[PDB]
């Protein structure tokens, strides 16, 4: 199935990510997705954005005690975290996840959107595309039919429902609102520089629009001489 | 011959004198300015990539945090050694008093 198009705002050429949503999607990840998924490469410092400034990130940074700190022997989980603390992990070992995921693996979702062909869409679709299995459906273990899912046997447990959680902003927590919002966050994290870049690209387009006709005019100055040269053959 | 053929008409290409030259220079000037503008930006960020009677230390902030009861070339002063009962740096012989003040040697501060 080829996921159809979707009108993501940030995707606008010169427009950028809506941090508010991003924030909302980070909440969604913290309250739902972090039980099997973790933004390993993302740190509270990485988490910083209009969605969450370092200050807010600090709150979240202090909001966790899992594997943030080690003990006399650095085993298990022994102390809470701070700004530099990287995102907590639902599992201290791959086996742990495997164990708590039907034996399957709940992938950390740091670069998940980048990873999936048409990720942003896929994500939205998968989280909200279980649809209906009309026939020949034998979900073996903790699977969930989803035509959007490659095998319609996602096993990514559908973790979002109307008012699955409660957005602190108060925006109605409808499955879709929730899905779209977290999507933004996930996208934001996958490319912490999406906004940064697009500003460069705008400056690059303005500079090239200034510089291309001027360099063309120089070239046509120094090449006019020849382009006007008139040759004449005058055999004696 | 020498005079049979007069210079052909280039008016088609001919432009209507220093003013013309100035304009053309102005163009080169602006373009050079554009190149330079980009240069400061590119080079800066380009370079930017490479950018980021006893003593006890806890390596606070990646540096030895001496706590007690080298200004010269950066070695570790050795506590409880030296001619000033404070510190001594085996690198070049700087003797620090208990206050950590450089008293003898080549350590600057």
């Amino acid at each position: 199935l080829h996921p159809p198009s979707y009108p993501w705002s940030h995707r606008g050429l010169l427009s950028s990510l809506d941090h508010t949503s991003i924030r909302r999607g980070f909440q969604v990840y913290k309250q739902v997705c972090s039980s099997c998924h973790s933004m390993d490469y993302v740190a509270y410092r990485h988490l910083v954005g209009v969605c969450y400034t370092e200050e807010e990130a600090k709150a979240l940074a202090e909001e966790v005690e899992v594997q943030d700190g080690p003990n006399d022997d650095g085993e298990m989980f022994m102390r809470p975290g701070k700004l530099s603390d990287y995102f907590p992990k639902p599992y201290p070992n791959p086996e742990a996840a495997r164990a708590a995921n039907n034996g399957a693996l709940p992938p950390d979702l740091s670069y998940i959107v980048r990873a999936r062909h048409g990720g942003e869409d896929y994500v939205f679709s998968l989280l909200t595309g279980y649809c209906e299995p009309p026939t020949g459906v034998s979900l073996r273990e903790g699977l969930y039919f989803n035509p959007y899912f490659p095998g319609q046997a996602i096993g990514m447990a559908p973790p979002i429902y109307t008012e699955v959680l409660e957005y602190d902003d108060g925006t109605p927590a409808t499955m879709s609102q929730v899905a779209k919002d977290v999507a933004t966050f996930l996208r934001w994290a996958s490319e912490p520089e999406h906004d940064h870049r697009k500003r460069m690209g705008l400056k690059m387009l303005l500079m090239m629009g200034l510089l291309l006709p001027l360099t063309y005019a120089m070239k046509r100055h120094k090449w006019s001489v020849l382009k006007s040269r008139k040759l004449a053959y005058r055999p004696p | 011959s020498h005079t049979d053929v007069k210079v052909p008409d280039f008016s088609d290409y001919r432009r209507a004198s220093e003013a013309r030259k100035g304009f053309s220079y102005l163009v080169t000037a602006t373009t050079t300015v554009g190149v330079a503008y980009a240069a400061k930006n590119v080079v800066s960020q380009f370079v930017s990539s490479m950018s980021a009677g006893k003593n006890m230390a806890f390596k606070w902030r990646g540096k030895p945090l001496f706590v007690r009861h080298c200004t010269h070339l950066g070695c570790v002063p050795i506590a409880n050694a030296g001619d000033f009962g404070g510190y001594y740096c085996p690198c070049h012989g700087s003797h620090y008093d208990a206050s950590g003040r450089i008293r003898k040697g080549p350590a600057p501060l």
């Binding site: - | 000037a29 602006t30 050079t32 554009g34 330079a36 503008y37 400061k40 930006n41």
Partner: peptide
Amino acid sequence: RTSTFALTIAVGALFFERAFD
């Protein structure tokens, strides 16, 4: 003047950077 040409240009690039940045 050629030298001033470069000079004003260097200064032009100088300020343009700030403005464009």
